[PDB]
């Protein structure tokens, strides 16, 4: 349904599974290398072929350990989809942004750390106001034509910027982008639902959503307080702990109790319902997951069974409980 059920990324010819594995906080940080190898083996043996990293995660070190799995187990390169994100490269002035120099140097450094010849998709992590769009589109077309990448996409761009990039690419006979990475969960619904279907129907740009469990909030583990060895109790995540322990968090926990009652009526768990709720429409191609141990990943993979049970009545009941449906 989602994993080992493959679909096109946008309208391009690249086919991905609808569950992916992310390389944020855990990799190189919170967890060890053996746990990371166990998580990658468990993801690969169930049919997941999409893995997403960036050059800013753990000062690049996470990318290093990703390479140390791929060269170790001896998997074929043609059966994997590897993506990277480039905005932040260092403390100097010329080591950030979306200029031609930093795009070429950052992609070369990321390919050197990954021990690879090419990636499949290279993303721009955020828009750059100091660079013209023509220079960015020409730099992306240049790194595609040199064999260092196959496709490119955007992340955290608005609809006008994606349409401007498409118009510049059609003007000078260049390569348009194929995908957009956006945040999407039960308390963040506006951009995926009211803005992106027009871009999918018009120019064929797909969506690859991230953070489906709101950094662990919709899992329901914070019903009492802050448990030990969680993301909110780590050093450097005081913003998430202040967001949980505020006054809106209690209303979110009450709505999570009602949604947990619905999910227990359906015969599943609340993270499985939260993951499978994001894939109910055809505008979303894949969902990137995060996990800290093998039990969480084995629980999160099981949303495939609860995906075809979502009728219109259960969706209407969930929308009645949540009460934040955007008007269009």
């Amino acid at each position: 349904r989602q994993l080992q059920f493959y679909r096109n990324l946008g309208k391009s010819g690249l086919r991905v599974s609808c569950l992916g594995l992310g390389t944020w906080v855990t990799f190189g940080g919170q967890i060890t290398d053996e746990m990371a190898e166990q998580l990658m083996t468990l993801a690969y043996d169930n049919g997941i072929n999409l893995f997403d990293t960036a050059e800013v995660y753990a000062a690049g070190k996470a990318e290093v350990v990703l390479g140390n799995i791929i060269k170790k187990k001896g998997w074929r390169r043609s059966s994997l989809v590897i993506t990277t994100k480039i905005f932040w490269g260092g403390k100097a002035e010329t080591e950030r942004g979306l200029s031609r120099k930093h795009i070429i140097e950052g992609l070369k450094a990321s390919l050197e750390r990954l021990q690879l010849e090419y990636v499949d998709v290279v993303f721009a992590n955020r828009p750059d106001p100091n660079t013209p769009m023509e220079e960015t589109v020409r730099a992306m077309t240049h790194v595609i034509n040199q064999g260092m990448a196959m496709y490119w996409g955007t992340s955290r761009w608005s609809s006008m910027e994606i349409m401007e990039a498409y118009s510049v690419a059609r003007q000078f006979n260049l390569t348009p982008p194929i995908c957009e990475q956006a945040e999407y969960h039960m308390f963040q619904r506006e951009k995926v639902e009211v803005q992106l279907p027009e871009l999918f129907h018009k120019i064929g740009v797909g969506a690859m959503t991230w953070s489906p469990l709101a950094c662990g909030i919709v899992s329901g583990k914070y019903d009492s307080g802050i448990p030990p060895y969680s993301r909110a109790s780590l050093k450097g995540y005081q913003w998430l702990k202040d967001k949980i322990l505020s006054e809106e968090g209690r209303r979110q926990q009450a709505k999570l109790k009602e949604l947990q009652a619905i999910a227990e009526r359906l015969g599943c768990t609340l993270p499985q319902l939260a993951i499978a709720w994001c894939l109910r429409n055809e505008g979303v191609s894949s969902v990137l997951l995060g996990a800290s141990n093998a039990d969480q990943l084995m629980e999160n993979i099981g949303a495939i069974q609860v995906l075809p049970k979502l009728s219109s009545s259960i969706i209407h009941e969930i929308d009645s409980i949540l009460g934040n449906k955007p008007y269009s």
Partner: protein, 106 residues
């Protein structure tokens, strides 16, 4: 929905017209002023809207948007062809009434 700045290319049987989006979105109840109605004529390979229709009638249609609402039939176009073009582009009842008042018998 500011609808400003972008340039729009409209292709009528090989004849190309260029305008701005804020010219088109002055009249949101027409075919060209509504993004939901003109989306079925978009060509993704060429970044333009294509219509397989009458070529000399579209200059008056574009001048209706550019002048702020004035309808004037071209000399070399008959009455019924221009009436069918006004009916296709969905300019409204008051544009038809102004066209009837500007052409005598109405």
């Amino acid at each position: 929905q500011d609808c400003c700045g972008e340039r729009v290319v409209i292709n009528i049987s090989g004849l190309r017209f260029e305008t701005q989006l804020k010219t088109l979105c002055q009249f949101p109840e027409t075919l060209l002023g509504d993004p939901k109605r003109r989306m079925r004529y978009f060509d993704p390979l060429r970044n333009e809207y294509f219509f397989d229709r009458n070529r000399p009638s579209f200059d008056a249609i574009l001048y209706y948007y550019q002048s702020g609402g004035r309808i004037r039939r071209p000399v070399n176009v008959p009455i019924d062809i221009f009436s069918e073009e006004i009916r296709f582009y969905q300019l409204g009842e008051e544009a038809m009434e102004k066209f009837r008042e500007d052409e005598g018998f109405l």
